[PDB]
Amino acid sequence: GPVPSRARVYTDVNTHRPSEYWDYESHVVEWGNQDDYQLVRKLGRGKYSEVFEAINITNNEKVVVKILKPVKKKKIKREIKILENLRGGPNIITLADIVKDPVSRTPALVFEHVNNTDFKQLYQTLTDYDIRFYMYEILKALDYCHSMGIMHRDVKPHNVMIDHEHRKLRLIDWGLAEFYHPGQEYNVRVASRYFKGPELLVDYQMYDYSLDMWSLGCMLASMIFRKEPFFHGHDNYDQLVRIAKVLGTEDLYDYIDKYNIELDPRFNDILGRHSRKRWERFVHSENQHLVSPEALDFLDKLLRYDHQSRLTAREAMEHPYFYTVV
Ligand SMILES: O=P(O)(O)O[C@H]1[C@H](OP(=O)(O)O)[C@@H](OP(=O)(O)O)[C@H](OP(=O)(O)O)[C@@H](OP(=O)(O)O)[C@H]1OP(=O)(O)O
Ligand SMILES: Nc1ncnc2c1ncn2[C@@H]1O[C@H](COP(=O)(O)OP(=O)(O)O)[C@@H](O)[C@H]1O
Ligand SMILES: CC[NH2+]Cc1ccc(-c2ccccc2)c(Cl)c1
C-alpha cells in the first residue's frame, strides 16, 4: 500500500491536547437569538450557504450572517468548533455569534463585517508591494491555524476578504477546515479545483497543513503572472495534467514513487510527457512589474509536488521576498 506521511511542523499539537479541543461532535453548541440582527442585503451565495450583511440592533454595528444550507450536522459542528478555537487569531474571521431562526430552525453563523474591496478592481491596481504585504497577512493566518492543529483546506481568493482602504485582511470560510491528526487518512474531495494540491489529485489521503501551502502558491502565481486561474483544469484529472504541463512529468513520477502512490487509470491517456518549465517563461509585458527573482524563488518553493518539500508557513514568512514588509 501507500507509504505513510506526517507534517514536518505542529505534528502532535492535537495529540497532547484534551479531547474537548478537537472533539467537535461532543462540543455543546449554544444558539443565540436571531432577533438581535436585522438583515440588510445578500452578499453572496455559495454551494453551502447564503451570506447576508446585517445590523446588530443592540449596538448599531455591521455584521455578516451566514445561513447555512442542508448539510451534515457533523460538518456544522466542526466549523463552529474550529472558529471558536481560532477566535482572536491574526487575520482569522471572528465568529461573533451562533443563531437559529425561531421558525424554520435554520442555523446561521454571525461574523465581523469586512468591507471587501472589489476583486475585479483590485487585480488591476495592486502593486509589487501590495502583493508582498497581503501574502504576509495570509501567512500570519496560516501559521496560526496550523499551530492550533487546523488545516483550512479551501485557501483561495474568494476565501480571502480584503478591505484595501484599511489594509485589513481576513481568512474566511472554515466549512471545509479540519483538525490535523498524524497518520489520519482524510477525504481528498476538498478545496476548489484550481487550488487542489497534487496529493488530492493522485488520491493520497495522508496529507497535512502543506496542502494550504500549495493553494497559497496557486494564488501567488495567479497574482504575479496575472493569470487566473494559474492552473486551469477542466476537471480533477485534467487539473493534474495542467500542473504537469508546468512542473513536468519527471518530478511527478518521483513524487508518486516516493510515497508508493498508484495513479488512477484515467491518467493513462491524458498525462503525456512534459518537460519542467522555468518560472521566468511566465513573465510578460503586462506582468513584469510584479515579478522579481525573489518572487520566482519563493513561488518555486511553494509549488512542489512533494508536500513535505514545500515551505511551511513559518519558513515562508522568513523568505527574502518578505524583507520589504518585514
Ligand atoms: O479557458 P480554458 O479553455 O480552460 O483555457 C484557458 C483560456 O483560454 P481558452 O479558453 O481560449 O483556451 C484562458 O483565456 P480566458 O478564457 O481566461 O480568456 C487562457 O488565458 P487568457 O485569459 O490569458 O486568455 C488560458 O491560457 P492560454 O491563454 O495561455 O492558453 C487557457 O488555458 P489552457 O491553455 O490551459 O486552456
Ligand atoms: N466576513 C465576511 N465579510 C464580508 N463578506 C463575507 C464575509 N463572509 C462571507 N462573505 C461573502 O459571502 C461569500 C460566501 O461566504 P463563505 O463563508 O465563503 O460561504 P460558502 O462556504 O457557502 O462559500 C464570500 O465569498 C463573500 O462574498
Ligand atoms: C472575493 C474576494 N477576493 C479578494 C482577493 C483579492 C486579492 C487577493 C490576493 C492578494 C495578494 C496576492 C494574491 C491574491 C486575494 Cl487572496 C483575495
User: Which residues line the pocket of ligand 2, CB cutoff 6 A?
Assistant: 43-44, 46-49, 51, 64, 66, 93, 111, 113-114, 116, 158-159, 161, 172-173, 175
The three-state secondary structure class of 195 is helix
> Ligand 3 atom 2: the closest Cα is on which residue?
158
DSSP 57: T
Backbone φ, ψ for residue 253 (5° rounding): -70, -35
Q: How far apart are CA 72 and CA 163, in angstroms?
A: 32
DSSP state of 148: T
CA distances 120 to 54, 103, 134, 218, Å, are 24, 38, 16, 18
Phi, psi angles (nearest 5°) of residue 64: -130, 125
The DSSP element (H or E) to which 142 belongs, if any, is helix 128-147
Which residue shows C-alpha cell 494564488? 219
Q: From residue 76, give the alpha-carbon distance in Å to each of 134, 178, 209.
A: 29, 12, 21
How many A from CA of 213 to the centre of ligand 1?
Answer: 25
Q: Measure the CA–CA gap between 186 and 73, rounded to whole angstroms.
A: 18
At residue 58, φ and ψ (nearest 5 deg) are -70, -5
| Residue-range domains of the chain with CATH | 5-22+114-326 (1.10.510.10), 23-113 (3.30.200.20)
Mapping DSSP to helix (H, G, I), strand (E, B) and coil, where does residue 274 land? Answer: coil
The technique is X-ray
Distance CA 270, CA 242 (A): 10
Check if the beta carbon of residue 117 is closer than 8 Å to that of residue 165. yes
**What residues form DSSP beta bridges with 42?**
52
**Nominal resolution in Å?**
2.1
Residue with cell 515562508: 316
